[PDB]
Amino acid sequence: VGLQAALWLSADRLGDLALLLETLNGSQSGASKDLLLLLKTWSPPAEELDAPLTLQDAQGLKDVLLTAFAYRQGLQELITGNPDKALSSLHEAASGLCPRPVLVQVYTALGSCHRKMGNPQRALLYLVAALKEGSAWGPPLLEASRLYQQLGDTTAELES
Amino acid sequence: CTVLLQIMERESGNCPKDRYVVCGRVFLSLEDLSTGKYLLTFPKKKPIEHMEDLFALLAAFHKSCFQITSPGYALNSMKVWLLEHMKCE
């Protein structure tokens, strides 16, 4: 089911996905139309008893799904232009299985969220953190450019 | 027994200030232990509500300290390991 749902989440079938998971947990969780709550509620069943081996387990996939879905949702909420609903899910992304490029992109993404809210000093904080932790530091320099443009500090924008 | 807290200062190379202090005096007997009263005995005696009992296990038990460094992920698994796999209160 995890892999299946991974295919659908790679292919953007979120309407069918949440319904599948509604079926998976008790359908009393029917009005819980949110995905990410539903992914957390999803509880793979066993401690995986002495069975044939496998390259990956149900738990390591729930741990991959929570971070993938929360990242993708945070970028959709950003681009659609609601950078207050973002912060919650873009923090729930780092609070999980978050590889070091996924972390770099969450930090840039929160720089963007803060720039849009008009909080340049916080956005500078997250962008310096993204520079530090990352080895892929293009997008951070871009977000700094866009933030100094939004402000006016044009020599800084140009240096970025 | 009698309990003696000894103290030695380090900065002053005069060896000056050894404020001994005799802090109480401890009696035990087998008649006491036979009625418990001082023992720490495992399970069911879970809900530790005299904090001395907790400081006893941090004193009696063997201690080892590990640094964990993930160079390529983040580290939020620890509380889960601790709370779900180890079922910690």
Structure commentary:
Chain B: This is Fanconi anemia group B protein. Chain B: Belongs to the multisubunit FA complex composed of FANCA, FANCB, FANCC, FANCE, FANCF, FANCG, FANCL/PHF9 and FANCM. The complex is not found in FA patients. Chain B: DNA repair protein required for FANCD2 ubiquitination. Chain B: It is found in: Nucleus. The structure is cut from a larger assembly and holds chains A (160 residues) and B (89 residues). With 160 residues, chain A is mostly helical. Chain A contains nine helices and no strands. Chain A has helices spanning 2-10, 14-24, 36-41, 58-80, 85-94, 100-117, 120-133, 139-151, 154-159. With 89 residues, chain B is α+β, with helices and mostly antiparallel strands. A two-stranded antiparallel ribbon of chain B has the order 1-2. The longest helix of chain B is centred in the middle third of the chain and has 10 residues, at 51-60. Chain B is flat and about 50 Å long. Chain A binds chain B through residues 94-100, 103, and chain B through 72-74, 76-77.
